[PDB]
Ligand binder design. Structure first.
Ligand SMILES: *NC(=O)Cc1c[nH]c2ccccc12
Ligand SMILES: *NC(=O)Cc1c[nH]c2ccccc12
Lengths: 122, 360, 110, 361
């Protein structure tokens, strides 16, 4: 199931803002920043909180719940900036909102990169 | 010759605009750039550390910033603050300590506002639990934390009252807070539901009149909140769109995406065709000019890929901003007239503001 | 002409011209502080044909202006001739050493 | 399904890593080190370095040392100049070493932030603007004391044939040698005869460093040398990089970290450009020239790719060059360098690249 397993995919595909699971990413993809889709770059810390949403996987035709955790405590990665907004909503629907720093509750709130963690079927 | 400091900004206050540059690629070095809108001249700047927010005091004398420091930037103790700066000397005057939960996010106007009378700064917190923080400017102190606003977002001041503001809540209604002269909550009220959160979400940016506010939705509808009385009366939707517009799927998009010219009731909205889920922050293909009394469009002009705007009432001006460049329009007549573009005003800005000239 | 890197007085500027930053050639932008120390350049005046001493004081205590970056090196020398050298921050001894912009102050004839 | 985790090490082995010191001059308070794999151009991670950071890797390859300045409120408040020790494999902060508030703030010449050959002391340039050399005892995590003998001198050239000795270039045109004791204090010193005329033939500070000698190039394309094989430094020069044809076209050196030495062959690498005149000493390279320092002849010339800085790896026979944003990787195992690849967009404003050390005992 390559479409669910980014580490088995072509890096060029995964590092693209058009990759199916990056549908509400506002920030730099961690997989372009020395990490992977599910691992923070060295010396950056996962956020315990995140925005969330669902993304459609056109490869298997199913819909998945994504958690858009950040990596924190290093200055901006600067690589692979995305600003995708599928099903994103304003701050009165706060956990669907991606114009806030989801590092906000970390020990160090400096934003490094963001990613898309697959939680399960929607 | 001798190099000197201590100088004031070289252009009158009435010429000045403030471009909040997030510098997202290097967000620890955000800053406010001060420009003269009449000629594009760079006048100065205020440093704002990590993800600064900015506003100018209503009386025009001070600049307020909100930011976060850490002892060693990426490690060490956090300090969230408001800073007061002199508007003419662009110098730091005082730091006001905040609890370590000020909102870190993009520069929507409604995250960092003030009461009409200018005595209190009103700011959004997120820990991620939301609340509204009140800062007493004169005392230099954080004086109130409005937990009534949990699950709500952003601050819309009421221009017809000295210390009142509204916030948009998770029920699709509005919470109004009236502060006392001490900055503590003096009273509050909750409107009926204005919009369906699930079916017709609104953009948070208000098109703000003296006694009412309009909001546009993801689908191009308009909602209104009338605060001519103590109780806010809500209505809507009316559609921005006629049948031809619908056929090309026109919808609003942007950040600080609307404005109101109070003397005429004209509302300005960034719009783009081929709207669908996920296009609500797209750059403007057009600016539409709506008559809010007749609920009909009166003009449309090219959008110049703008994302945010602001209006000056008394000089009848609109600024638009595409992230890097500021466009200056004359809106004294229904069709806006482009006067100039200020290129390279910022690297990554979603907010521009005029220096206030209307007083308190 | 004064906002151009080719203006004759800017012949050893490495930095942002303060005249593009809300100041002038001899005044810091509002809220930035002059350096008490500087490098010095010797620049040829194309009008009178004479060489002049220019003192490149910085303005300090605000983050980088970012406008009108210049990197001119006429008569500039390495750090073993320290006061002729422009690859160091001449804000280094200020109360706040953050570099904002560079001024071009006419001292007098060489 | 998935869980985001931290605590990970750099994905590529040490021998593949290079460090691009990005000043980010447009936003100099957010300078940083970018870590790349030179074999494939992959971005591996980064170390934040606040205002105008400097960087070096420990000689043993285990730690990254940075030097930077903080203030309590960035543009106001109390100054803290520091060295930081970071783990090289985890790219995590370990320790801060306090410095007096006069560490050099300036462009990233190698010689501003170095270490003794034995790796026990960090040796750094101070400027208040009075100059001195600062010594940091890495084991203790302490600043030792200023080398005040180095007043009026600039930059640090370690002597690779001794454990705790280095030289600095003085305003008299000679070299001052400092020999540290085991505590990091000055045990002895000496001053060479004048090597170069400061007025008439100023040298670039960047050395082409051998195990027991250093070569320097001048603004006018001459070469000077300092031989420290013996008790005291012996100086000589000039010899010219230039033949008649070169002179006729006004070829001269230019750049920042603009030279390098391949020690096993004695080849010296230098960035050069034509139409030299007053004010062109920091011009990008039109060409890289390769000189045999024994025969004093040029053995190759290749396009410069607008490079400004370089570094050499003795263990893999490589040269990196850097134009401010892009890193070029060359094989220098033969007299003519061969370009292997360019890493685009490695930095916004970098004048220094360095290899992760391999071996070198
Ligand atoms: N998704 C993120 O957390 C990155 C991000 C998006 N908007 C902002 C604003 C401030 C800091 C980080 C941000
Ligand atoms: N003329 C200056 O002081 C500006 C400048 C030139 N090089 C540097 C390096 C670090 C900080 C400021 C600098």
């Amino acid at each position: 199931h390559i479409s669910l397993n980014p580490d088995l995919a072509n890096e060029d595909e995964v590092n693209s803002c058009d990759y199916w699971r990056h549908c509400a990413v506002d920030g730099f993809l961690c997989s372009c920043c020395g990490g992977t889709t599910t691992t923070c770059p060295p010396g950056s810390t996962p956020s315990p909180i995140s925005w969330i949403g669902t993304c459609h996987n056109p490869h298997d035709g199913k819909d998945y719940l994504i958690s858009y955790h950040d990596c924190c405590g290093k200055t901006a990665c600067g690589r692979c900036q995305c600003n995708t907004q599928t099903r994103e909503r304003p701050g009165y629907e706060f956990f669907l909102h991606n114009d806030v720093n989801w590092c906000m509750a970390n020990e160090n709130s400096t934003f490094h990169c963001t990613t898309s963690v697959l939680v399960g079927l929607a | 010759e001798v190099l000197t400091g201590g100088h004031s900004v070289s252009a009158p206050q009435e010429n000045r605009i403030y471009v909040m540059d997030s510098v997202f690629m290097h967000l620890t070095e955000s800053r406010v750039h001060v420009y003269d809108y009449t000629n594009g001249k760079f006048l100065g700047m205020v440093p704002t550390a990590f993800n600064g927010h900015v506003q100018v005091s209503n009386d025009g004398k001070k600049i307020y910033t909100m930011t976060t420091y850490h002892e060693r930037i990426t490690r060490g103790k956090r300090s969230d603050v408001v800073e007061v700066w002199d508007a003419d000397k662009l110098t730091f005057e005082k730091e006001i300590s905040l609890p370590p939960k000020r909102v870190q996010g993009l520069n929507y106007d409604g995250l960092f506002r003030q009461t009409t009378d200018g005595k209190f700064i009103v700011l959004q917190n997120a820990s991620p639990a939301t609340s509204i923080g009140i800062v007493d400017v004169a005392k230099g102190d954080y004086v109130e934390d409005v937990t009534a606003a949990a699950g709500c977002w952003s601050v819309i001041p009421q221009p017809n009252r000295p210390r009142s503001f509204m916030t948009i809540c998770g029920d699709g209604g509005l919470l109004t807070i009236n502060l006392g002269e001490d900055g503590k909550v003096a009273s509050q009220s909750r409107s009926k539901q204005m919009f369906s959160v699930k079916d017709d979400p609104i953009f948070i940016a208000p098109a703000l009149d003296k006694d009412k506010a309009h909001f546009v939705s993801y689908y191009g509808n308009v909602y209104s909140a009338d605060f001519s009385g103590d109780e806010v009366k809500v209505d809507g939707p009316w559609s921005l769109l006629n049948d031809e517009d619908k056929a090309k799927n026109w919808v609003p998009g942007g950040y600080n995406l609307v404005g109101l010219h109070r003397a005429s009731g004209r509302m300005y909205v960034f719009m783009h065709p081929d709207g669908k889920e996920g296009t609500h922050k797209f750059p403007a293909a057009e600016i539409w000019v709506m008559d809010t009394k007749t609920k009909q469009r009166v003009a449309r002009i090219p959008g110049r890929d703008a994302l945010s705007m602001t209006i000056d009432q008394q000089r009848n001006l609109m600024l638009t901003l595409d992230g890097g460049n500021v466009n200056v329009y004359d809106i004294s007549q229904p069709e806006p007239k482009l006067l100039r573009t200020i290129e390279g005003a910022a690297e990554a800005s979603l907010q521009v503001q005029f220096h206030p000239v209307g007083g308190t």
